[PDB]
Amino acid sequence: MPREIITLQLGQCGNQIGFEFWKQLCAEHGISPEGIVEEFATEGTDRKDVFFYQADDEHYIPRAVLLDLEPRVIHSILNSPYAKLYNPENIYLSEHGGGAGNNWASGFSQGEKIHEDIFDIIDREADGSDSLEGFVLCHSIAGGTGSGLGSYLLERLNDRYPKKLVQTYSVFPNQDEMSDVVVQPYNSLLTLKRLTQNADCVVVLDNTALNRIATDRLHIQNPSFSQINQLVSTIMSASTTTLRYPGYMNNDLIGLIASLIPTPRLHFLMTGYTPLTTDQSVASVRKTTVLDVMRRLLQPKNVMVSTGRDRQTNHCYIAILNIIQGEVDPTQVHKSLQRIRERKLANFIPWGPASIQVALSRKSPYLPSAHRVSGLMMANHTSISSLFERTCRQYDKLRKREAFLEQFRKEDMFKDNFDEMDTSREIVQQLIDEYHAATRPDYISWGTQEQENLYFQ
Amino acid sequence: MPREIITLQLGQCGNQIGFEFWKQLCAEHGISPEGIVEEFATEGTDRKDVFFYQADDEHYIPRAVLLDLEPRVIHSILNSPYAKLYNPENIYLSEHGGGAGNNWASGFSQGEKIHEDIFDIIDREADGSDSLEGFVLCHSIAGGTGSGLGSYLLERLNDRYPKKLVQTYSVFPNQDEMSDVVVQPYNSLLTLKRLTQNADCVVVLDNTALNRIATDRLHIQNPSFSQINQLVSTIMSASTTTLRYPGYMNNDLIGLIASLIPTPRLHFLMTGYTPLTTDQSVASVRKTTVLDVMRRLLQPKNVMVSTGRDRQTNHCYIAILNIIQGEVDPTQVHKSLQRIRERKLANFIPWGPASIQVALSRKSPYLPSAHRVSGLMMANHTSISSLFERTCRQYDKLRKREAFLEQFRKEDMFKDNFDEMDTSREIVQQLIDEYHAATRPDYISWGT
Amino acid sequence: LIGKSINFLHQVCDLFTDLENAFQGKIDAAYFETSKYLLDVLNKKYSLLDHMQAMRRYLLLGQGDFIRHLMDLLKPELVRPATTLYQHNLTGILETAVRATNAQFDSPEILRRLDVRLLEVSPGDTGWDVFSLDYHVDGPIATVFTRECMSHYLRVFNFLWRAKRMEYILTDIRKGHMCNAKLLRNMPEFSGVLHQCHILASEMVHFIHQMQYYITFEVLECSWDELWNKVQQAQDLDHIIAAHEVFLDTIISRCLLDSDSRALLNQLRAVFDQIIELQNAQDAIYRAALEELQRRLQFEEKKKQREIEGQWGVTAAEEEEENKRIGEFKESIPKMCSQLRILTHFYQGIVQQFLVLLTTSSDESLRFLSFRLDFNEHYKAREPRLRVSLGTRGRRSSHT
Amino acid sequence: EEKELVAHLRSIKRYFLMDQGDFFVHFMDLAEEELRKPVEDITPPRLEALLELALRMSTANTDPFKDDLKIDLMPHDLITQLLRVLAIETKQEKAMAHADPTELALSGLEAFSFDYIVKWPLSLIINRKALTRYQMLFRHMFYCKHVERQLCSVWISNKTAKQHSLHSAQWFAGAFTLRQRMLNFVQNIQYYMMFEVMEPTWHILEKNLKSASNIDDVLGHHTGFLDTCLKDCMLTNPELLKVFSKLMSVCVMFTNCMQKFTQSMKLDDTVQLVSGFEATINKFDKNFSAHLLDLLARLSIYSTSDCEHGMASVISRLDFNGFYTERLER
């Protein structure tokens, strides 16, 4: 049976991102915005069941649970063309419509309030799945609601499906734009915590890199947050294409994340894509050379992930899963990974066999690709912790200053203390230590408290 | 990979010259003003990566950095056809918009204030370049902003790509005309200083020489400031052609200037082009002969550097490379060499090996050539010292008079003293002396 | 050739001066026309192109969603002894996986030809050893899809299915380990055992999935597409038969299903067996770690609940038993990690030797399998042959 | 028409005559690290991939015949091969036969040539004798480009060295002047070979191929083209070729010395190291100048005794500024 993926939509921004992700998956699988297979979608070679569930023999319904503390986004989804894709019983909107006030703790309390609906949606999607692989949580790290609700959804998916894989698409906040959400670092820390502890694979999409690309290539002086979020959703889609487009290998979510996630604790993945082009720039058939492509991939302005400079950890690849979209020959993907190894773009564990898995899949005929050749790399690299460690440190810096905490004190999770923030910081620290351990032969013992205490001394 | 050139645009005049240079390079490479490859650029023999960088997989952006201390020029660049050519992260505009007040030191201080943006621009262009050779700074030496900011950009270009060669096309101010910019001689000195210290070869573009070329060769009675900037951009194109038009030899900027620059100090180059035509003068296709080409290139009236007619000193070229394209008769080449020798129209260096390298390439289908046969010369010529020596003498004359120093004292670099202007004048004097030595056999010991 | 084509259609679907040349051109033209008519009849009556497409979808693993779903459904069944497998049950599982995957969208004429075959069930056999896809060829299409061709296609199908089954078993082991890490966060001493299980399962999944990818795409899918293109471009029935036979032989060789690749096939089978062993060891380690984590969590929950009720959270006997259980779990975690490391190292050695043999194999698909198995150059660090094969031959043909 | 002789010939010009400078730039950028290894240490896969990158990277990707372009690693360096060939029936034949093949692992840079796949019936015209001449031209241009790239790298490295220590600038002036003599020399040799030999002989071939009456005329014109390019590139004179080889070897050794010194200065008895570097540069300058004067003297000799009027062009290019004229007279 196909490996179904349950989509968890958290908060206003997260729910919008999840809706656009489900729209993109439907477009790639030829599913209409109403959840009905189009009459023209006769090429039954796509794996819709990876990301969508069938409600009947003809109707594919997204395995999506919409949870928000503000009603505006949920109403916009129910007012969108994709209103019929989602189960209406799987859409939770807070009656008060007030949102989480950009408070991570408020978002967590809202997730707790919508816990029943979201977990009922996830369980309903899993029971309709013969071999449900797991849940995918879609959320924003910059708001208040989407981060806490996403962490709640990840926790409940881990609790309910302890033998199932949990992949996450974790959007990192843009670092070049001034976020109006001053408490964003707490939300980002909680989301990175939940991805580290309760997800099996988290593809980090740093909006900062999206903004940099918008600035340098589109000549946009001030890249908006919306363009960065759409780039992050595109990156997550590209990283999940091998799960959503079945092929010879890595045709299932557990198979997709197995090659990407070497250890259960070292589950913080970094992504890279090349060549990167903006949707608007299709106009200029650029004579990009192979040399220019490789140099641009190494150029931070063209890479869709802004990984921090971790100075403490000799970051290496723990595991790599390559999701290739388009016309791909398995031998060509293998040669490409080999060339990456020759350039030492990824260091692998020395104590066991590890590689970049390559799946060859046909492309969707319905989706126009702006790039003649594209590729996504998913890798677990300790340098992704530098983003998460920095988010955790900023969260702790805000909590120690009680900045924007008045919005969180309204929610029960933060009424008495800020213990949820400290637990998030500890989870991100354990993730950093495990990712550093995953660079070492001792990765067999990664995530053991003795290694966390040895990397924190 | 092509040898990419990063363009540094400084001040109003420098930014206009840089914009026109990038436009001309795009036309030669068949790049639209929007960064799209033109359908007419089917001759894939041009190095677009020399003048443009890829910003993404589809958009080619000119490697141009727009730096001004006054917001007018930066806004004009962002409102120009080249707005999409430059990386928006590579455009630095001073928030105060006040400019440098025609003060070289103020322009330098503004460059120091915009140092981060400029070096970020250089690094972004280098990372987008597979085999970045270096940065070329286009600016005017006569204003306040474009000269100082150009020197700042040159310093930051050397700092950011310190292992990469940096050639510059530095337009030096006319020293024989009274500049309305009283601090221009200081500005000219600062530009010659930066060319001497951070460039490996400096082609001096004298706006007086640009006007002379427009009058005698382009038949332009009154060359506009825009025409002077376009002449400077043409000079930069001619000096960078070996980087921008790959062939069997001189396929990189460091390789191109290596043959031209015998010593690091003897880096003051003079340029000449023939036939020189104004954009308006395209109508008359002059049947220029090889003899006429060589004579006009060697003629100061058509040369993009205004050297005085020294009758006492045998000023000479250190090296000259003429790339000639089109129908050339060997007998006409022979007659041209004969006439040049008889008229002594070109003196060559006596102290080292130098020749005219010839690479045969097809012409760009996208760039209209006004001449059935055309040729560019890039040369290191001691007569450029006459421009640099005059600029240095004028700088010293202004600094000793504290002329226009009040505008510089507003900027921190010149608040306490004008020592930067005097150091610039001394550097330009040493550059002039080294360039003059390069005409002599004793150039081996120049600067000792 | 004309009379042969006529017989195939029936059973399966100047003369005064230079007599020798007067009819030669006419004989050749008539031969061409008769052969073309025979090939068209064979195609129209036996659906040769449709049989080739069915072979591509099922036996060449072209319906990658179908193969994925079959392997996922078989994983809990194929780990069991084959002696308990029912061929009817395996076919029902295949049909269920089809209905649960994009295989349900295949045409009824194609889907009816894709089936699950169970080999003779022996004790100790896994499903990977007995599961195969088959494609029934008959009539005129059986002239192109001969019994040899069908056997080669079924061999490639079974090999890919076994490799995918082992990959999915190891992926399920690693998924369980990763998910239980969330549960075992409250039992950090047990987390390392789960991580070691995840690492071993990830290595085994990588090996098996790379072998399956090579077989199904580089060998099976490409040879099937070549067969279909040749049949569509076939000028005669004999040309179609020969082109399909050559395609099937190419698929067998590159999927290691031919007679000559038998050593490569044995090395790949040993790699798959070591990957399955690693998967099973990792799944057992992760199961033990998750059970220990669940016991620790239940003990902590009971303690907290008793404390909330104002009772002494744990009795001294109960507290000693809980501490003993946590101690035993922590002491088994290093042991579980060591066992998983040993299994991973054995699997990696077997995979490296298989990759070396594949890189030395004449089949290009095997070279692609070697390149995929050592994408991070882990096997290339362990198997010299994957590094040597690409470097040595190209320099020799460049010296002339 | 059917064998597209002119299209194949244009492909040969594009690849073997290094007409596609952007192609050669891209190829040498991708392959320089792999070709710098000993031929035994070179991975042929990397050269084929760099070739494919250069093919895809150049405007040759629009060439329908680009796939006929191959990388060929010659068993002998071009200079030893040409000297052995020219020594046939010469007094040097015995000296080349008794010349131990120097244990210098032949570098890919010295072994690199193109080959071109010509199918029947076009294999009648683009035969192995033609392909081998194209390979010789390719390897010659590639080696000239290697020497140019080394002189430019030494230039850049020296420009960087001039930026790190103001005081070392005086010591670097002599290395700069040596590099500049080598660079002007290398560029003028490349210019002669490209625009007066390869380009003229190709234009003559295309004109003669346009005037061919039969396939044997086309073959004759192609052979005459290859023989003209070979003659005018100084490849047929063993003494000139041997002096050019020594000159290029001295240029490469100078560039390697300058690169090592600039790298050392960047990473950084120092006065002793500087005096040793200057002494090495002066020894390279002396050797280069001696070989250049011997080259110009040989060109003048062949120009006067053998009526090789082309050799006067080499001399005029080599001494375009009269730098060697006083030295030639001396």
Residue numbers in the entry:
A (entry chain n): 1 to 457
B (entry chain m): 1 to 448
C (entry chain N): 241 to 253, 277 to 663
D (entry chain M): 533 to 800, 838 to 899
Question: Anything the authors wrote about it?
Answer:
To address this, we collected a large cryo-EM dataset of rec-γ-TuRC with CDK5RAP2 residues 44–93, encompassing the so-called γ-TuRC nucleation–activating motif. Using a similar processing pipeline as for rec-γ-TuRC, we increased the CDK5RAP2-bound rec-γ-TuRC reconstruction resolution from 11 to 5.1 Å. Gratifyingly, we also observed a pinwheel density in the new 3D reconstructions. Focused 3D classification yielded a clearer NEDD1 pinwheel density map at 6.9-Å resolution. Prior work showed that CDK5RAP2 induces CDK5RAP2:MZT2:GCP2-NHD (CMG) module formation only at rec-γ-TuRC position 13. Our reconstructions confirmed this CMG module persists in the presence of the NEDD1 pinwheel density. We built a molecular model of rec-γ-TuRC decorated by both CDK5RAP2 and NEDD1, showing that the NEDD1 pinwheel retains its structure without disrupting CMG module formation. Notably, both models adopt the open γ-TuRC conformation, based on γ-tubulin:γ-tubulin distances and GRIP2 domain rotation angles, relative to the “closed” rec-γ-TuRC conformation derived from microtubule end-capped reconstructions. Thus, CDK5RAP2 and NEDD1 can simultaneously bind to the γ-TuRC, and NEDD1 is not predicted to significantly affect γ-TuRC conformational changes during ring closure. The pinwheel also allows CMG module formation on the γ-TuRC—at least at position 13, explaining how NEDD1 and CDK5RAP2, key γ-TuRC attachment factors, coordinate γ-TuRC localization and activation at microtubule-organizing centers.
The γ-tubulin ring complex (γ-TuRC) is an essential multiprotein assembly that provides a template for microtubule nucleation. The complex is an asymmetric cone with 14 “spokes,” each comprising a γ-tubulin molecule supported by a GCP2/3/4/5/6 subunit. NEDD1 is a cell cycle–regulated protein that is important for γ-TuRC localization and microtubule anchoring at centrosomes and within mitotic spindles. We found that the C-terminus of NEDD1 forms a tetrameric α-helical assembly that contacts the lumen of the γ-TuRC cone and orients its microtubule-binding domain away from the complex.
